[PDB]
Write a protein that binds this ligand. Sequence first.
Ligand SMILES: Oc1ccc2[nH]cc(CN3CCN(c4nc5cc(Cl)ccc5s4)CC3)c2c1
Ligand SMILES: Oc1ccc2[nH]cc(CN3CCN(c4nc5cc(Cl)ccc5s4)CC3)c2c1
Ligand SMILES: [Zn+2]
Ligand SMILES: [Zn+2]
Lengths: 358, 358
Amino acid sequence: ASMERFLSVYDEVQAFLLDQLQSKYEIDPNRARYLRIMMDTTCLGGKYFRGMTVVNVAEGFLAVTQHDEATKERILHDACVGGWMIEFLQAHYLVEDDIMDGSVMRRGKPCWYRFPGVTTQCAINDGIILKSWTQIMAWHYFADRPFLKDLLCLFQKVDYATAVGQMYDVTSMCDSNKLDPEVAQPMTTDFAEFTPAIYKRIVKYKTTFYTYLLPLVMGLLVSEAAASVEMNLVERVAHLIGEYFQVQDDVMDCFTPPEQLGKVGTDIEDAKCSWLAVTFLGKANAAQVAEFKANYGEKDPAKVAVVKRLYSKANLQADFAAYEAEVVREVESLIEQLKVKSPTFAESVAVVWEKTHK
Amino acid sequence: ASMERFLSVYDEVQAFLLDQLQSKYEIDPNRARYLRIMMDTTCLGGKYFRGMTVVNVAEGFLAVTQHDEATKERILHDACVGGWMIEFLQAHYLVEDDIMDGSVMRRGKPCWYRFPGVTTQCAINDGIILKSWTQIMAWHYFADRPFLKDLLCLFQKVDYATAVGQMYDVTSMCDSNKLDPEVAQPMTTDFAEFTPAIYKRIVKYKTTFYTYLLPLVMGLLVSEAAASVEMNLVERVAHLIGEYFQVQDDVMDCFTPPEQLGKVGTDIEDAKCSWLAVTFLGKANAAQVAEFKANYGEKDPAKVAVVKRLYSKANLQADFAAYEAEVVREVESLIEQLKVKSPTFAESVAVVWEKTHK
Ligand SMILES: Oc1ccc2[nH]cc(CN3CCN(c4nc5cc(Cl)ccc5s4)CC3)c2c1
Ligand SMILES: Oc1ccc2[nH]cc(CN3CCN(c4nc5cc(Cl)ccc5s4)CC3)c2c1
Ligand SMILES: [Zn+2]
Ligand SMILES: [Zn+2]
């Protein structure tokens, strides 16, 4: 099974990284232990959706391509390593984003920086190490691979797009004309930049490149199958599914109970440009817009409750159902176009969509 | 002149990065302005020692090798780009280290995160962007270069060694046996880990890889001259000069006036494993060791003054002169060994040493 193989490779990669720190970086057993615990706490515990997508794409191609058994094993091992590079990249951005946002919990556990023996001083560096490990994995495991250059190039572009996305996200509540390193940034008062186009740009860069595009294209690279697809369709479908994924996360932040969510959602307090805020502003009357402005982006729980009740009374479920019908329609159309060059790849995309939609 | 060429290339690289953000990353003029100012504030203003070393090494080879004029220009441009990759890598670690350490000033100006319109929330990400830019530079400018693979591999190893070094540095005042993410870390009471061997390990990784090794080897790579040297001698001399550089920085932190230093030095308050603390512990009697333990690593200015006077009365100038005589001796010996394969490269190393020593 794919999951058994995926988790066995984590143990192998972890052992390799820590053994390398001992043999080449003069590490002591106590600092190796700290880094082992850091890796487990930051990398494990999720669903491994991003990493398993690489494995699933590679598995799809194996089913229709002629290979020696040793080659099938090599491809599957490469897909697991590539999938772990993505999981570690996600771990890097979660560690850093939790510090930047002052987050309290992550997956029902405290954020890494909040651990007593960690602190922000160490956590920022731990986050840096997590991303350096993705490169150590690539150069070691893919040293002789024909796809090494393309993989490192794609990984770099995705990482950069994601850092650009975090900038778009953290500054989404400021007026663009006021951005100035010399002047403390006031929250917007007009919310003129809370538009579907601006929200789409935030989401496209902050999450879709690393959550959907990177796993799909990495699965193609380790399979030596990039010629079986039209890359423009891959980008379009990845960006489309990724946006839907984030709209789901925005709604859950506001209404999914903290116990089920695994944290206390603070998007309203943080004045985030969420799908709920953009959509609400897209249908509210003058009175509702005014009430929203007087209560958004403030920590006062009475003000947060006003925003939540404004959203509830605005019937955003109808807009969500309408957005979802449009996404089902467009995703199915792009899947159909993917079948022209690769029915196998289209099938992996269908599975990626099914898992997102539910 | 090398400096004129080096600074002209910064303008070109800056223009390329910002133009790429507009054409491919949907950036708006206000966020491009913020990133332009961030780049200038974090990358410029230093002596450009690391970046200019790449240029100087490449210039040395140009003087003794046959090339068309267009090739000499291509090599010099590659050396400037490679030198800027190192300067931007340094900018990344300064931004992040200033946040981690809670630093106030850097080069007589506030630390980047302390700017009113920046904040830690943005600065951590700005630091991440600074390092992604080093990779954007490499993939763009060195796309067709024979040294691209070796350069990216060397850059990754140096970056990882540096992140490992920051971990060694930030945890240098804890007892290794007590390192535990679950438990808040107490300061050491015995200072048994304040030894010359442990101090050497901190310094080797936290600064010598990126300050000395990377500029020298990058100069060789862009010159296609790695066969003109014995790499083991390059590593040994880089590590040796780098250690001397850091011993100088440790002494200046404690005794160079804040006006000349460009900041208020806090190594004593921070309980850092500095050359002054290790050397003092290496010659103190029982009474002096006891007085050091009762005053080190505390913010109280009276306690800091006791440590500074303990250092002053301990005649650490004699130990420094003795360490310096040994370094002059070993650096000169390694330079002599470098002459066997490349008198030109040995000469660039002599210049690197002269600039460090003064
Ligand atoms: O006033 C409050 C404050 C906090 C609260 N927590 C839970 C509630 C009770 N419901 C409020 C309405 N609701 C919404 N579900 C969606 C789903 C989509 Cl896809 C789009 C818009 C909405 S609106 C579900 C939970 C509540 C009410
Ligand atoms: O008590 C204090 C407190 C703060 C102070 N600031 C300046 C001073 C006055 N001098 C104190 C001694 N000194 C040192 N120079 C070096 C150089 C090396 Cl290489 C190694 C060890 C030392 S010791 C220079 C400045 C002073 C005194
Ligand atoms: Zn965030
Ligand atoms: Zn530091």
